[PDB]
Amino acid sequence: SIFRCRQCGQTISRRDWLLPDHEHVVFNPAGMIFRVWCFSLAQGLRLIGAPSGEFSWFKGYDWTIALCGQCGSHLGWHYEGGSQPQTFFGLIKDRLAEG
Ligand SMILES: COc1ccccc1C1=NO[C@@]2(CCC(=O)NC2=O)C1
Ligand SMILES: [Zn+2]
């Protein structure tokens, strides 16, 4: 079961790569609600800019904006600088399509 970019079909992740709960409903400072699925691994993304800790939803992690490497759609964030695990992907579920 493969996760693709909803806009262009870019290969992003797999159900097998979900990181357990795997679903987190969060809000950013602009009040936008994101239903975020955590993945151990993802591909086909472009990480833009430098990591930031500001308003991180996950204690001990910095985020980098993750675009679809193909169409540039915002699919979520790469998280790093934490412990167990050091890195993971928080992807916006409704911006993916499952096979
Ligand atoms: C309007 O947005 C911002 C403006 C300024 C600084 C940060 C943000 C952010 N929006 O969403 C983020 C995504 C990563 C995260 O874990 N938490 C968030 O809240 C970061
Ligand atoms: Zn795309």
For 92, residues 6+ apart whose C-beta sits below 8 A from its C-beta are 34, 35, 36, 74, 75, 76
**Single-letter amino acid code for the residue at 59:** K
Q: Is 38 annotated as a binding residue?
A: no
Sorted by where each begins, the domain ranges of the chain are: 1-99
The answer to whether 12 touches 91, Cβ cutoff 8 Å, is yes
User: How many Å lie between the centroid of ligand 1 and the Cα of residue 27?
Assistant: 9
Phi and psi (nearest 5°) for 64? -130, 135
By three-state DSSP, how is residue 7 classified? coil
- Closest Cα partner for 53 from 80, 90, 31, 91? 80
- Closest Cα partner for 75 from 57, 52, 92, 89? 92
Phi and psi (nearest 5°) for 26? -130, 160
* Residue 90, CB-side half-sphere exposure with 13 Å CA sphere: 20
User: How many Å lie between the centroid of ligand 2 and the Cα of residue 99?
Assistant: 15
User: How many Å lie between the centroid of ligand 2 and the Cα of residue 70?
Assistant: 5
In this structure, what token pair is assigned to residue 37? 């699925």
DSSP string, 11-78: EEEEGGGB----EEEEE-TT--EEEEEEES---SEEEEEEEE-TT-SSTT-EEEEEEETTT--EEEEE
Phi and psi (nearest 5°) for 86? -65, -40
Superfamily (CATH H level) for 1-99: Peptide methionine sulfoxide reductase. (2.170.150.20)
With b for 16 or more beta-carbon neighbours within 10 A and e for fewer, the 43-63 pattern comes to ebbebeeebeeeebebeebbb
Ligand 1 pocket, residues with Cβ under 6 angstroms: 28-30, 54-57, 63, 77
- Closest Cα partner for 36 from 95, 77, 92, 81? 92
This PDB structure is determined at a resolution in Å of: 2.0
Rounded to whole angstroms, the Cα distance separating 8 from 96 reads: 10
